[PDB]
Design a protein around this ligand. Structure first.
Ligand SMILES: Cc1nc(Nc2n[nH]c3c2CN(C(=O)N[C@H](CN(C)C)c2ccccc2)C3(C)C)c2sccc2n1
Length: 314
C-alpha cells in the first residue's frame, strides 16, 4: 500500500493518529517537508474525505493549508498537505492562558481572511475551531479540515444546530473563537450536551473584566442568536475593532493563484520534462493534484522561502 507513495516521498515518523493518521515526510524531488494524511478505506465516514479533497482542490489561499498530491490505492487514500510545524492554535492558547487584545487581533485577521475567501468561492467551513487552525513555519495561521464543508457543539451556531444559511454560521463560530482567544475558555459550556444546546439558544455569556468595550461590542455583534441580526462577513472585514492599529481592512483575496504561473518554476519543470515552455504551462494548469501539481507547488514554496528553484534530480 505504501508502494506508489514511496516513489515520491521519504516517510518519517507518524505525528498524529485519530479515528485518519498523519505522517511527516520529505518530497524527494524538491527536498521540502510535507505532511501526509492517510485514510484506510475499509474502516470508513468516506464521503467526508471526498468533500475535503474536492474543497481543497478548488481552494487556494495564503491562510489555507495547501493540498499538493492526492493518491489512492485499492484500500488507502493519501492526501499530501503543507507541513505546519507550529502546531494547533488551541495548544498555543493553552500555553499562553489567553492572548492580549493586540495579539488576538493579529491572529484573528488571518482567520477572517481565510473564511472570507472560502465564502467568496461559495463554501462554508462549518467546523471552525482552534484545533482546525495551525501555525506554519512563519508563525502564520492555516485553516484545515474541510470534511464538513458545504456548497463541535461549542462552536456551532444556533441555526445550524436547529437545522434550517451557511455564511452566517461561520461568523458565529468565529465569534466563539474570538472569545476563546481573549478569555482562554468557552463562552458557552456544559458537561451535558442538551444543557449546552440550551445555553447556546439563550445566547447569554459571561463577559470578563479584562475585555475592552470595543471587544465586547464586536463579540455581541458576532454572537447574535438570530442570524439576520448577526454581523455579516463583509462588515467584519472593516469593523472598527479589526481596523484598530492597522487602519486598513482584512486582505482576504488570494495571493496564491490558479491562473498565473511562476516563470522560474515552469523553466525548471521544462528542463526536467524536455518540454517547451507553453506545453509545460498547459500541463501544470490542468491542476490534477498528481506529482506534477505537487512538485510545481513545492518549488514555489521553495522560492517563497528564499531557496533556489531547483529539482534534486538524483
Ligand atoms: C499531527 C500533527 N500535525 C502537525 N502539523 C501538521 N502539518 N500539516 C498538518 C498537520 C496536521 N494536519 C492534519 O490534518 N491534522 C488532522 C487534524 N484533524 C483531526 C482536524 C489530524 C490530526 C491528528 C490525527 C489525524 C488527523 C495537517 C494539515 C496534515 C504538527 S506540528 C506539531 C505537531 C503536529 N502534530
Amino acid at each position: 500500500d505504501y508502494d506508489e507513495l514511496l516513489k515520491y516521498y521519504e516517510l518519517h515518523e507518524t505525528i498524529g493518529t485519530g479515528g485518519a493518521k498523519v505522517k511527516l515526510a520529505c518530497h524527494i524531488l524538491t527536498g521540502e517537508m510535507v505532511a501526509i494524511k492517510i485514510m484506510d478505506k475499509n474502516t470508513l465516514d468516506l464521503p467526508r474525505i471526498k468533500t475535503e479533497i474536492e474543497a481543497l482542490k478548488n481552494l487556494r489561499h495564503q491562510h489555507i493549508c495547501q493540498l499538493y498530491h492526492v493518491l489512492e490505492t485499492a484500500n488507502k487514500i493519501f492526501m499530501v498537505l503543507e507541513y505546519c510545524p507550529g502546531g494547533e492554535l488551541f495548544d498555543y492558547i493553552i500555553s499562553q492562558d489567553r492572548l492580549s487584545e493586540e495579539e488576538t487581533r493579529v491572529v484573528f485577521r488571518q482567520i477572517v481572511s481565510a473564511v472570507a475567501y472560502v465564502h467568496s468561492q461559495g463554501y462554508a467551513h462549518r467546523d471552525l475551531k482552534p484545533e482546525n487552525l495551525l501555525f506554519d513555519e512563519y508563525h502564520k495561521l492555516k485553516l484545515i479540515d474541510f470534511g464538513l464543508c458545504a456548497k463541535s457543539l461549542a462552536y456551532a451556531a444556533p441555526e445550524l444546530i436547529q437545522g434550517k444559511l451557511g455564511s452566517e454560521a461561520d461568523v458565529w463560530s468565529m465569534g466563539i473563537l474570538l472569545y476563546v482567544l481573549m478569555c482562554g475558555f468557552l463562552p458557552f459550556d456544559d458537561d451535558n450536551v442538551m444543557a449546552l444546546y440550551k445555553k447556546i439558544m439563550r445566547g447569554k455569556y459571561d463577559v470578563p473584566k479584562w475585555l475592552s468595550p470595543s471587544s465586547i461590542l464586536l463579540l455581541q455583534q458576532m454572537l447574535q442568536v438570530d442570524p439576520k441580526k448577526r454581523i455579516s462577513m463583509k462588515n467584519l472585514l472593516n469593523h472598527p475593532w479589526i481596523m484598530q492599529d492597522y487602519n486598513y481592512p482584512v486582505e482576504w483575496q488570494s495571493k496564491n493563484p490558479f491562473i498565473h504561473l511562476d516563470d522560474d518554476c515552469v523553466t525548471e519543470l521544462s528542463v526536467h520534462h524536455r518540454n517547451n515552455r507553453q506545453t509545460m504551462e498547459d500541463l501544470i494548469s490542468l491542476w490534477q493534484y498528481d506529482h506534477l501539481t505537487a512538485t510545481y507547488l513545492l518549488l514555489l514554496a521553495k522560492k517563497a522561502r528564499g531557496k533556489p528553484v531547483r529539482l534534486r534530480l538524483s
